[PDB]
């Protein structure tokens, strides 16, 4: 009698009955290859976080289930024998569990809402479904389109006040997850390319902190100052080689140097070189760029 | 009860079975079930791919030939077919050209469709969507978000099917289909509700002379009841509702393949008005007798000539329909002379079939 | 009471008009009725031409075009056109090459056509006849003297349609229809009743899941009423009486025009039996949906294999109708090769049309 | 009694007695701000889980808390009622929940083992909780300190299954979320460096994606082809200004270009720079480097 169970039975009454119950439709191994690969971010994010629930609540009696946007089940976990009473009835890898197909259910109401929403007994409008429990809440990606559902399902005696918030908090993580993992990714692809494109120079670069210590240097510099690239991140100048006269007084002074000849001391071996020196005026200091111009 | 039907859960199987036989220009697939071109995939050209619930035939399996659709998926009776249906049905008719999507605008067809799609494309299929929106009657219905997808559906199939077969770009088709379903308006009544098979009753019910005016097909209520009076009547409400329903704003949403993602597009409609010619199409929802249409043709003629309306082609008959539910939509497509050439084409489908 | 019609007296001068204003291809005469193709005569071929009363649409008015009718004759609803009407119509058509009436097996038609003929002799018009009985569900019905004519009219029309067009004399053509009605069979069910508009109330009742079985066109009493159990035993049923009931031997009488006589001409039909070729039309008695159809059509092909019969056309859908009846029959006409190549030629009339 | 209260009762039994409470010691208002405006990052993303894993649970006799690493109570919420029976012993906010004040706990034994923690009944050292049930989890820091925990605690005769793990899908997720949320600010501190590294080069650079589409101009390559910085980003490059037919064959061709002289038409005007292009082949195409050299 909620306002949105409701109308899902409108929904649902002009086109079924309540005591019918077919196998609902699975989609066929090959092509679930298909939809499961299409989920990879989000199935790897949700799994850790129900076989972390899960360990924290077995034993008990309910299942765990991944759906997609369409209520297709991607993946399962949780009791064993209650992921086989729900087998019993039809809901395995790849079933789609629709409004149109198994009836009103937070499985699929959920994500028809919008919201967490929570189905159990009766509300039910398939009879085979009236000793379950369901808990779902469903998910978006970074547009706000919705992209999958967390459910959980347990017999209904045995519903608890945390189930609809369990599924919540753990569509927040999955969700919230995609959204900042996204973010990630983006903003270190964007590096990549920032990096490539030094990587890409025709001179030999190397930049350091007002600390002193090496930020960035390129292959190109790596192979002029015979220094490793990465051993040397971070690591004070001085210390990674010893500077000429003119450099250690144009770093004091903070005065730039154009094509200014100059030699290097690394690690006992002396590198002549061609340089140019700018400072980077900052807030917390200034930082350097050297630059290594190959004759 | 008056179904011609075996057991309830057959009914879908034995009459596909019935098409499949009937028709053997057609493969039936099972497992899961989809109906193509017997000859797909037709290398060369934009293969065009449609379907929703089963229930409205011919609508869309009568559809699929030379010079319209390439395959359709049915689902069950009123029921979005589901992703991967539509997914391996656009692999068979995949032309090498891109595939085009027609889907009516439902909340299960949009978000079934939607995601069959995007499973195409990950799998490195060009694809595009056109959604078809043309019941004037409703803003959200029961299935629906927005305005319901009816029988110009069938119009654009045709016309967009035409196309395809000339030899149009995955691009032209779908801007084509998409400039259409701007011009195309509908409305239907209907005096006596469909039954589903599943659901054993009426899926409504209406008291006597007494009309559920602007219905949808899968039996969702209307802009209301009302007695009905006379053919003239209804033909009179049903023609000024198309006009002032006609102006209308919103977003539809389409697949940009380059992009990979769903790019949103606003849109208005223009009403009809003095000086327009279209294609007008008198549309059996179910059990309304053929003489019926006609009469109801007749008046249709009346109100359009007299709001200046040229009336250049037709069809009159069962196209969209809805079970057994007795009523009748009526589709005016606004057109050019590029459109009625496109119509003129050729079209070989068990349920449309003129030209060379 | 679920009508879509105006003034009960208007009902059918509004669909004609709305008939005329689909069709420019054809012409209603007005003071008195009929239509005709809107290029008649047609100089050089045999004219052919039908009626009967109004209720059957597309029967006989959709099948006027090339390749079939010339022009027909509708009467009121249920029932016969008048000799003014069939004679007139028939001199409007008259190519120079004679004139063929095809008449349903009724009364009214046999009695009304009859008189036109002599009619139209007595007026120097080479003329004649042939009759279709091809319902083999009751002997002797209520309007009817012996076996009524159902759907195999349409198969007839469009069989001697071609053969007219073609070039085919006016014997040859006639024999042509007199032959293939010893070769047609049908029966219908119906398991809800026409309504005709004058009567305003149901042509007869059914209770529950009860049948009217061996149904015919006017809603007469079939063989019976017997409980409907399901689709496929009824199509069962339907199937194994075409089968029994097919022998049968009967006079119908033709107008021998060099004599200017009624000739009576015993005649005998042959059962369907192993190894036969078939034409086979599944056809909706009004509003049955067209999906149920295909489930008949499946069940049929099913049983057609079972006994050696051959299926080498088939149509599906709303070709010889009751008003709004809720049933279908079954036609199943013999065939060998000129007449498919016969049926395989073009027609092009609002209701059938194939070919270049 | 499993070894870890068992441990912890060892703890308290040195020191305290089962039967006496001491309203636990509560943080002045003007410290307890500094306390809460530390933490401000956990707790916009935790109060928001809270407010939600509450919305969903109401009605129902509960609390939720988040809790620092000291275990300070920062915020609270769930059932008026229930707070208000908490309160009355003294859970406030500010209020410290250590175990060597309130006894063994799970507000104070989760973050001591390290993990998820359930304790109810009498669990609890202390008698005045033996009609409580608390789970807690603690939650970790980028480099992984204890950074703080989040508690439920209820009725003990309503403890659920789901209490845990529902609080655990909470840590999981506010962690989660701090975690990669720093993560994110380090790698865009990397991407203002890496800028401010190429924005000081001598050449102006520019560079296209393998859709042809400019990802990065500097400040020096803007003036020389008069483009407007940040406008011309992310657009198509031939739209952009006229490619010299030299350019064109080589980014078709992808083969590099040293020190070549060649005209740039970028509107209306005809501007003449010295270039060099470099391919860099990657797995999704290729991109190019222009660099302009100044005369």
Chains 1, 4 share one sequence.
């Not at chain 2, 769903?262 to 279209?278: A, C, F, H, I």
């Not at chain 2, 043709?297 to 709001?307: D, E, G, K, V």
Request: net charge negative; hydrophobic share 40%.
């Amino acid at each position: 009698i909620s306002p949105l169970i409701a109308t899902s039975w409108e929904r649902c009454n002009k086109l079924m009955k309540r005591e019918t119950w077919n196998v609902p439709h699975q989609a066929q191994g090959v092509t679930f290859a298909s939809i499961y690969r299409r989920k990879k971010a989000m199935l790897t994010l949700g799994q850790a976080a129900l076989e972390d629930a899960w360990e924290y609540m077995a034993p008990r009696e309910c299942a765990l289930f991944i759906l997609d946007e369409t209520a297709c089940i991607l993946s399962r976990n949780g009791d064993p024998q209650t992921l086989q009473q729900l087998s019993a009835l039809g809901f395995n890898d790849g079933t789609y569990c629709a409004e149109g197909i198994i009836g009103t259910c937070a499985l699929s109401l959920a994500a028809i809402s919008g919201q967490a929403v929570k189905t159990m007994a009766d509300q039910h409008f398939k009879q085979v479904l009236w000793n379950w429990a369901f808990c779902a809440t469903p998910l978006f990606d970074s547009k706000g389109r919705l992209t999958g559902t967390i459910a959980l399902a347990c017999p209904v005696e045995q519903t608890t006040a945390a189930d609809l918030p369990l599924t919540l908090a753990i569509a927040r993580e999955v969700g919230n997850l995609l959204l900042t993992d996204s973010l990630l990714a983006e903003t270190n692809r964007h590096l990549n390319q920032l990096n490539a494109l030094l990587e890409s120079m025709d001179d030999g670069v190397i930049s350091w902190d007002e600390q002193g210590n090496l930020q960035f240097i390129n292959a190109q510099a790596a192979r002029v100052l015979r220094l490793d690239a990465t051993a040397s991140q971070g690591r004070a100048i001085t210390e990674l080689l010893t500077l000429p006269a003119v450099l250690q007084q144009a770093i004091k002074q903070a005065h730039p140097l154009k094509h200014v000849e100059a030699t290097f001391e690394s690690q006992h071996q002396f590198i002549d070189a061609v340089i140019t020196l700018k400072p980077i005026i900052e807030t917390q200091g200034t930082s350097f760029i050297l630059l290594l111009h190959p004759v | 009860m008056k179904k011609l039907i075996n057991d309830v859960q057959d009914v879908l199987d034995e009459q596909l079975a019935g098409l499949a036989k009937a028709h053997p220009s057609l493969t039936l697939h099972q497992d899961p079930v989809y109906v193509t071109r017997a000859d797909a995939p037709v290398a060369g050209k934009v293969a065009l791919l449609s379907g929703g619930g089963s229930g409205h035939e011919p609508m869309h399996c009568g559809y699929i030939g030379q010079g319209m659709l390439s395959g359709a998926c049915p689902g069950e009776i009123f029921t979005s077919p589901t992703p991967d249906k539509i997914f391996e049905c656009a692999m068979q008719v995949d032309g090498g050209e891109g595939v085009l999507l027609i889907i009516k605008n439902y909340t299960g067809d949009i978000l079934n469709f939607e995601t069959a799609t995007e499973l195409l494309h990950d799998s490195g299929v060009k694809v595009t969507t056109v959604v078809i929106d043309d019941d004037v009657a409703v803003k959200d219905s029961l299935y629906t978000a927005g305005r319901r997808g009816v029988a110009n559906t069938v119009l654009i199939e045709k016309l967009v099917g035409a196309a395809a077969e000339r030899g149009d770009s995955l691009d032209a088709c779908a801007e084509l289909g998409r400039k259409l379903n701007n011009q195309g308006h509908s409305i239907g009544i209907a005096l006596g509700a469909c039954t589903v098979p599943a659901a054993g009753k009426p899926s409504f019910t209406l008291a006597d002379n007494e009309m559920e005016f602007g219905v949808g097909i899968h039996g969702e209520p209307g802009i209301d009841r009302r007695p009905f009076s006379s053919l003239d009547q209804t033909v009179d409400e049903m023609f000024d509702t198309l006009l002032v329903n006609g102006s209308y704003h919103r977003t539809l949403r389409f697949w940009d393949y380059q992009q990979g993602s769903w790019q949103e597009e606003q849109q208005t409609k223009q009403p009809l008005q003095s000086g327009d010619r279209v294609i007008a199409l008198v549309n059996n929802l179910g059990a309304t007798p053929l003489s019926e249409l006609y009469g109801v043709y007749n008046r249709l003629t009346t109100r359009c000539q007299q709001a200046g309306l040229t009336i250049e082609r037709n069809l009159i008959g069962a196209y969209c329909t809805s079970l057994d539910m007795t009523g009748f939509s009526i589709t005016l497509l606004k057109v050019d002379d590029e459109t009625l050439a496109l119509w003129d084409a050729p079209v070989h489908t068990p349920a449309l079939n003129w030209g060379k």
